[PDB]
A paper describes a structure:
However, we managed to obtain good crystals that diffracted to 2.77 Å resolution using the [name]Δ/[name](124–188) complex. Two [name] molecules in the hetero-tetramer complex adopt highly similar seven-bladed β-propeller architectures, akin to that of the apo-form yeast Hsv2, and symmetrically bind to the N-terminal opposite homo-dimeric interfaces of [name](124–188), each burying ~598 Å2 surface area. In particular, the negatively charged E142 residue from one helical [name] chain and E144 from another chain of the [name] dimer couple with the positively charged R109 residue of [name] to form charge–charge interactions and hydrogen bonds. In addition, the side chains of R149 and T150 residues of [name] form hydrogen bonds with F125 and H127 residues of [name], respectively. Concurrently, the hydrophobic side chain of [name] L146 occupies the hydrophobic groove formed by the side chains of Y65, I94, F125, and H127 residues from [name]. The specific interactions between [name] and [name], as observed in the [name]Δ/[name] complex structure, were further validated using SEC-based assays. In accordance with the aforementioned structural data, individual point mutations of key residues involved in the binding interface of the [name]Δ/[name] complex, either from [name] or [name], such as the Y65Q, disease-associated R109Q, and T126R mutations of [name], or the E142R, E144R, and L146Q mutations of [name](78–206), all resulted in a significant reduction or a complete loss of the specific interaction between [name]Δ and [name](78–206).
The recruitment of the [name]~[name]-[name] complex by WIPI family proteins is a crucial step in autophagosome formation. As a key autophagic protein, [name] interacts with [name]~[name] conjugate through its N-terminal [name]-binding domain (ATG5BD), and further assembles into the hetero-hexameric E3-like [name] complex, utilizing its dimeric coiled-coil domain. Structurally, both [name] and WIPI2 are mainly composed of a seven-bladed WD40 domain that contains a highly conserved “L/FRRG” motif to sense PI3P and a unique loop connecting the two outermost β-strands of blade 6 for membrane binding.
Numbering used by the authors:
A (entry chain A): 10 to 263, 282 to 339
B (entry chain D): 126 to 177
C (entry chain C): 126 to 176
D (entry chain B): 12 to 263, 282 to 339
Write the structure that this text describes.
């Protein structure tokens, strides 16, 4: 195909990184610009986690010919163009989440937290239910060390503060069914959740676990691919199968349904985030399509930008 | 030129990143050793208090 | 612009320097406590070898 | 009103404490690098850490910005003080390395951690040290601290990495010390007494006398001593603004081969420029001079400026 194996936004959605069959690439989201491209003749990278706009990337090998064994996490130093820390595991790595002081690795059955040091030390292990999608969010903010992940019970989210791990975790019975997506706002004060039914998105307070807002995307089932907050957490964007994107208002009693939505014309699955304009939403699709949409108060969407980001 | 100041800054950032990594390594190393000693203290403490 | 690149880099440097100061501070503070607990381990060890 | 002037560790910059703040300048070519204004008062000491964002400030002047018994670490990227250390006595000078703050008082030297709460590591007693004579090697692999001992005319040298070793004590002069200088490698220390007739260079590891050099037969107040990059030369300032230039490794040549007068005659500090035959003079009146010498020992004045005015 096009060789894309992974796409993910950074902590503020200002960039997205792509794992490729032949390496990785980093891009500025808005305006779209290729920022870094590292080619590996020897194989692909199946997961890329940025730390904001620092020179550190977490890489996991993947694809038909992975650059690294899939049971290893590689921290890439993009200023030095080399791997500087490696952590090896007994099982495949499903995702990595970075903060400045912690490496969090996500495995199928557990979440291991390490020091971000030349010899990483394991600090914590949290058991999860079967987590093949690697669902985990970690607050990148210095004043909020929140780690959130699927609990051992179906539809529960366990929340742990990594600065006060002696405290019991908050367990949120978020859905009756298997979790499909989890998202934090930039402040780490709100968590958005969906089940495999994908009819409802629920936003909780991360400190109390209380439901703040329930948003109904529809009556029919949908595979939810992505959820993201805007910068002030007043809005969320929601991607679904067939590439539709729904736009809702969070934390507003005047919201329950989508004020806006658009379909991605190619229908390919996409992740979404908000642009630099408060009324901009960006969609990055598995086929390589980039879309920027502007919405209005009537919920009409206009296309501002379209590109194939993989050709730059 | 004004580009030369970019080059100097990039070197400073690269060097600072190494020093942060080294310091956090020494800090986390010592934090673990302190916890190991916090254990052996309480261990020997309760162990021979019962001796008394 | 070229100046804009400078501004980002200078901001990165100031944040990096802040972190070194914080790490060194936490490191020197912990080094002192560890030595104080090294001493309470010797003094308590001699007490319970005396018993 | 100029209150203080001092070179950084490589002489590539000099800093000025002012009645209304501080300034930093590049030594050669001369260019104003930074200007910080304080409406509330003066800075009487400014210690650079090379070309880093940290400056040590001590309040001074008629209306000091800070109490003179406090050391302020300035973060020049944040334009604010980030660390404060308070003392029972006035601060005479500060010396910085990346991991240590060294504070010179009139009669003792205290070494601290460079942390948000500095911890006192060492205290060394000195004789009465109103000039704040103290040099600290800035190199990561050399922690040499050198200062006036408790005995008149002695220099004490301490390695801040091996403080359990007995210090080397050098009986450098029969009279009160007036000036002390290290070379960039921290292998040599130059000294003068208040008699100022002799400059003596010692090895810092053994304390052995390497050279005894003569500035003249009559007395003179030595204001400054500095080595060139290879420590093959020293420049020496004295009263009347004369600068003497010596060969440091030639025992056959103990008198200055070259010297020039600073035309204003004001007391000045001196260092070598970027050119191997350049010497720079920074004078208390605000005059800057660069002189080029040649192998015959002839000196010509190349540059003059008021750095306080540009």
């Amino acid at each position: 195909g096009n060789g894309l194996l992974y796409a993910g936004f950074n902590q503020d959605h200002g960039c997205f990184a792509c794992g490729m069959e032949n390496g990785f690439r980093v891009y500025n989201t808005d305006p779209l610009k290729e920022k870094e491209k590292q080619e590996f003749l020897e194989g692909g990278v199946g997961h890329v986690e940025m730390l904001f706009r620092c020179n550190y990337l977490a890489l996991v090998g993947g694809g038909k010919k992975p650059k690294y064994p899939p049971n290893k996490v590689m921290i890439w130093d993009d200023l030095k163009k080399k791997t500087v820390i490696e952590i090896e595991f007994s099982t495949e790595v499903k995702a990595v989440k970075l903060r400045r002081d912690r490496i969090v690795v996500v495995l199928d059955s557990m979440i291991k937290v390490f020091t971000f040091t030349h010899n990483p030390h394991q600090l914590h292990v949290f058991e999860t239910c079967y987590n093949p999608k690697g669902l985990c969010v970690l607050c990148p903010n210095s004043n909020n060390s929140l780690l959130a992940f699927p609990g051992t019970h179906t539809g529960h989210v366990q929340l742990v503060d990594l600065a006060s791990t002696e405290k019991p975790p908050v367990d949120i019975p978020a859905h009756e069914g298997v979790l499909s997506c989890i998202a934090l706002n930039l402040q780490g004060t709100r968590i958005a959740t969906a089940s495999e039914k994908g009819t409802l998105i629920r936003i909780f307070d991360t400190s109390s676990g209380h439901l703040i807002q329930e948003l109904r995307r529809g009556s029919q089932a949908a595979n939810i691919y992505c959820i993201n907050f805007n910068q002030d957490a007043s809005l969320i964007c929601v991607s679904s199968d067939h590439g539709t994107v729904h736009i809702f208002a969070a934390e507003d009693p005047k919201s329950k349904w989508s004020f806006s939505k658009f379909q991605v014309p190619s229908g390919s699955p996409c992740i979404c985030a908000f642009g630099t304009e408060p009324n901009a939403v960006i969609a990055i699709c598995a086929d390589g399509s980039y879309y920027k949409f502007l919405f209005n108060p009537k919920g009409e969407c206009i296309r501002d930008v379209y590109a194939q980001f993989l050709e730059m | 030129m004004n580009e030369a100041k970019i080059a100097e800054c990039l070197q400073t950032i690269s060097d600072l990143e190494t020093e942060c990594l080294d310091l956090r390594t020494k800090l986390c190393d010592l934090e673990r050793a302190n916890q190991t000693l916090k254990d052996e203290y309480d261990a020997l403490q309760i162990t021979f208090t019962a001796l008394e």
